[PDB]
Amino acid sequence: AGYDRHITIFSPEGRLYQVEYAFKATNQTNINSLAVRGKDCTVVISQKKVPDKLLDPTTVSYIFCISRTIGMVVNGPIPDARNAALRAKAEAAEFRYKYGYDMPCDVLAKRMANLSQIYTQRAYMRPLGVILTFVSVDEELGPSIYKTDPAGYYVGYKATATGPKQQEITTNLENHFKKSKIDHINEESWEKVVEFAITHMIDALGTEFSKNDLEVGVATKDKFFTLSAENIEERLVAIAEQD
């Protein structure tokens, strides 16, 4: 009648309250993110909020380069976020050394989601208060988005969004794929896919963005990279010409 809420053991109802409270933690940063697939690319967009005038904007990031091909975006507090990243990087390097080929997106995801499950069963480990979104252009499955949570769950997406205002972005995208019929963004270049993602972020959230409000990651054939404030700026000049 008390401690079934403090460690990772079942409640009378069959629930794990420490897992449920971990999901709640992922929204502490008040930052939304989304991910879409192009013809032969994948784009992650996350909000960049730097509320303190004493910070260095370039050090404030929730997007990580896990490997040469895989990138990861995190919804959650930064120390848990950086924890998860370090492991993902180590897990990636080790896979390549052991198996002789770069770790796929869906495989890395499964791994990190298997680890998350462990913290859900063993009592001395707490779950991490983070939702991890991995992206790549897999040499077998093409553009890929895979997302893991504190429950240990993971699934592949056509597109996804995460954060406090997730449902706004989600319904917006769902309506686009019912309209377009296909399950990706029909565009040749990644530049016009980054534009699409920012456009649908603005149209779903209802807020305009400057070069410092955004943080972008792009996955192409054999390369994941993050855009500078300047590349985003170039991308924001392009959206403000069609409208």
Binding site: P12, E13, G14, R122, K158, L173
Partner: protein, 249 residues
């Protein structure tokens, strides 16, 4: 450091093992899955409950192959199932195939899985697994078999059964329809009808996962040469193969 070297499932005054009772509650909350055994095959089926209209249902397999002749399905917590499947595959090699050069019989791989779940009942600092499994398989000496494995670690052989949400109403539906002279095509027919009572939404090969343990599939082996190798008996049906039996249902 791990200071949890003591049991987390203990006996309550009444004789109940609290954590197991609760784990079973989680299994009732999970999506319905079932299994039926014909004279010349076994069928396992479940419903793909989608987390978001944006998620791709193919990337999540609720039905899994353990050995070429053995398949598994579940009701309950997905992540716990996943890691169980990983361990179930490994144990089939380490404790059997690396010793005898052949795959474990259905009853013995079940037995190994049961044990893995039992230890989660007694070891220091762990909760039980929150899943019930259905294992369907074939071996040369036993024929076709279907087993149910509970969070406690217990296992029962079944002619037919279901687990999860509508398991009560589904078991009643199966009792009406099952006999000892069923062909495998019939068992699939019943399986689809039994699963229709559980599903409110779309009922097609896109939202329903189904696999069989039937004849040897020579064209699924990947190689020709060895006459004693005739291919796996586990076959997962495609979205299209399911719709073929739903058009006349």
């Amino acid at each position: 450091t791990d200071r949890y070297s003591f049991s987390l499932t203990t006996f309550s005054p009444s004789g109940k093992l609290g954590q197991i009772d609760y784990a079973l509650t989680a299994v009732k909350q999970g999506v319905t899955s079932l299994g039926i055994k014909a004279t010349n095959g076994v069928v396992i089926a479940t419903e793909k409950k989608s987390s978001s209209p944006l998620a791709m249902s193919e990337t999540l397999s609720k039905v899994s192959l353990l050995t070429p002749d053995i398949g598994a399905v579940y009701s309950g917590m997905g992540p716990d199932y996943r890691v169980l499947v990983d361990k179930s595959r490994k144990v089939a090699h380490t404790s059997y195939k690396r010793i005898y050069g052949e795959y474990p019989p259905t009853k013995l791989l079940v037995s190994e899985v049961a044990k893995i779940m039992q230890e989660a009942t007694q070891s220091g600092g762990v909760r039980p697994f929150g899943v019930s499994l259905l294992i369907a398989g074939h071996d040369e000496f036993n024929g076709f078999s279907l087993y149910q494995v509970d969070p406690s670690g217990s296992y029962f052989p079944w002619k037919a059964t279901a687990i999860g949400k509508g398991s009560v109403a589904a078991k009643t539906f199966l009792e009406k329809r099952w006999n000892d002279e069923l062909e495998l095509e019939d068992a699939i027919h019943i399986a689809l009808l039994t699963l229709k009572e559980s599903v409110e939404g779309e009922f097609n090969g896109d939202t329903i996962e189904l696999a069989i343990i039937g004849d040897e599939n020579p064209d699924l082996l990947g190689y020709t040469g060895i006459p004693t190798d005739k291919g796996p008996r586990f076959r997962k049906l495609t979205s299209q193969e399911i719709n073929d039996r739903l058009e006349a249902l």
